[PDB]
């Protein structure tokens, strides 16, 4: 009983940690998307000249 | 066998409800956005093309 209780508690804590982790990557991909959006306008106005 | 605090079917229903809600959220996001891929994880090969 004691071992099973400990395992249940640990599994719950890991379940929380998973979403705690996922939020950070979501933020990172948002920032990267903004940067990628800017870079293409730079390239377009680059091919403008010449 | 009748016990107390053994509501396993409640746990099963909660799990299935969770997956259903996640699917609803993703479908609503997709159709509101009007895009297939969105984000960066739906397709790993179409973004570069």
């Amino acid at each position: 009983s004691e071992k099973l209780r400990g395992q249940i508690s640990g599994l719950k804590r890991a379940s929380l940690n998973a979403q705690d982790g996922i939020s950070l990557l979501q933020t990172a991909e948002g920032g990267l998307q903004n940067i990628q959006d800017m870079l293409q306008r730079m390239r377009e106005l680059a091919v403008q000249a010449g | 066998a009748m016990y107390i605090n053994t509501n396993v079917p409640s746990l099963t229903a909660q799990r299935y409800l969770g997956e259903t809600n996640n699917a609803v959220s993703k479908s609503l996001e997709r159709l509101s956005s009007g895009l297939r891929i969105n984000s960066a994880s739906d397709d790993a090969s179409g973004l570069a093309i």
Binding site: - | M2, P9, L17, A23
Partner: protein
């Protein structure tokens, strides 16, 4: 090329609508079954006691 690129834009709206409708229908059944699962066993046992 603009015809070629606009082939990964979005699904033909009909199938996305169908997915939305089916999931929306299924969620309420999940909720009702969860309610009855919460209701039944403890009341039955308290009747036994």
């Amino acid at each position: 090329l603009t015809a070629a690129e606009s082939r990964i834009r979005d699904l033909d709206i009909a199938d996305e609508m169908a997915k939305f409708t089916k999931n929306q229908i299924l969620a309420q059944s999940n909720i009702s079954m969860l309610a009855q699962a919460n209701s039944l066993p403890q009341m039955a046992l308290s009747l036994l006691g």
